[PDB]
Amino acid sequence: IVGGYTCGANTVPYQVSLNSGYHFCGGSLINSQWVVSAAHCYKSGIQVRLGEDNINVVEGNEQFISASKSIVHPSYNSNTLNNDIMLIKLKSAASLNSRVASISLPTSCASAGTQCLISGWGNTKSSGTSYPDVLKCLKAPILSDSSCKSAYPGQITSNMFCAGYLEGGKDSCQGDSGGPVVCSGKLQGIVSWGSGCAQKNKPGVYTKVCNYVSWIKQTIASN
Ligand SMILES: *C(=O)[C@H](CCCNC(=N)N)[C@H](NC(=O)N1CCN(C(=O)NC(C)(C)C)CC1)C(=O)O
Ligand SMILES: [Ca+2]
């Protein structure tokens, strides 16, 4: 997260870190045994880490649970990043409390202008590299689809939305992928892609979760 702030330990209870020997992507806990992340974050041998603040120090509220299965969206295209969403099932159900909680799926799609909270353990610099050990947060508005399309000609599908600032300076970045974009307590997006990070006129592009509620619900009901 570039140009954000330190969240505060366990203040984003649904934020999870996907670990395969190291943190490689974020995710959002949607119920005691399912996590939603980005399809581009797919890899075998995932251990889901919940209750995390400093990902490099065991501080006492963590729950490390291996994934039993991952389900990449059936129409995911890795070249265009269309349908960049994936479900991960935990081997055992997480113990839910104030610090570890699920985030609700949306009942409606959020509109341009809606303020959201984006979080993650990704790079904090737009040029160069610096990884924070504690969770970073960023309050950012969803941008209009026209400004989104104008920013990325021929690349924005109906399953994507831009969020951020055209001025640059504030955005998600490498290491934040798969993480949450929450608006009014509902998971509206997944950190997907962008050109570099926090660059002028290159806002973050997010998977439009509201388009996938039926798929998520049906997939969970049968797996
Ligand atoms: C996500 O972290 C990156 C995009 C963030 C959004 N950018 C922005 N708003 N301007 C994404 N990098 C990324 O997710 N990858 C793939 C998964 N990781 C990994 O360890 N790779 C394996 C092959 C799975 C081992 C981290 C790097 C990006 O740069 O597009
Ligand atoms: Ca920790």
From Swiss-Prot:
Chief location bin: secreted
Activity regulation summary: Is inhibited by scorpion cyclotide trypsin inhibitor TopI1.
Catalysed transformations (reactions): Preferential cleavage: Arg-|-Xaa, Lys-|-Xaa
Keywords: Calcium, Digestion, Disulfide bond, Hydrolase, Metal-binding, Protease, Secreted, Serine protease, Signal, Zymogen
Binding site for Ca(2+): E52, N54, V57, E62
Cofactor note: Binds 1 Ca(2+) ion per subunit.
Short name of one Pfam family: Trypsin
Cofactor(s) this protein cannot do without: Ca(2+)
Enzyme class (EC, first level): hydrolase
Post-translational modification: Subsequent cleavage after Lys-125 leads to alpha-trypsin. Further cleavage after Lys-170 yields pseudotrypsin. A cleavage may also occur after Arg-99.
Expression tissues: Synthesized in the acinar cells of the pancreas.
Disulfide-bonded cysteines: C7-C137, C25-C41, C109-C210, C116-C183, C148-C162, C173-C197
Compartments reported by the entry: Secreted, Extracellular space
Active site (UniProt): H40 (charge relay system), D84 (charge relay system), S177 (charge relay system)
Domain Peptidase S1, chain residue ranges per copy: 1-216
GO biological process: one example: digestion
Annotated substrate binding sites: D171, S172, Q174, G175, S177
One GO cellular component term noted in the UniProt record for this chain: serine protease inhibitor complex
PANTHER family, A to Z: RIKEN CDNA 2210010C04 GENE, TRYPSIN-RELATED
Family as reported in the entry's similarity comment: Belongs to the peptidase S1 family.
Subunit field text: Interacts with SERPINA1.
Stated name of the protein: Serine protease 1
Organism: Bos taurus (Bovine)
Taxonomic lineage: Eukaryota, Metazoa, Chordata, Craniata, Vertebrata
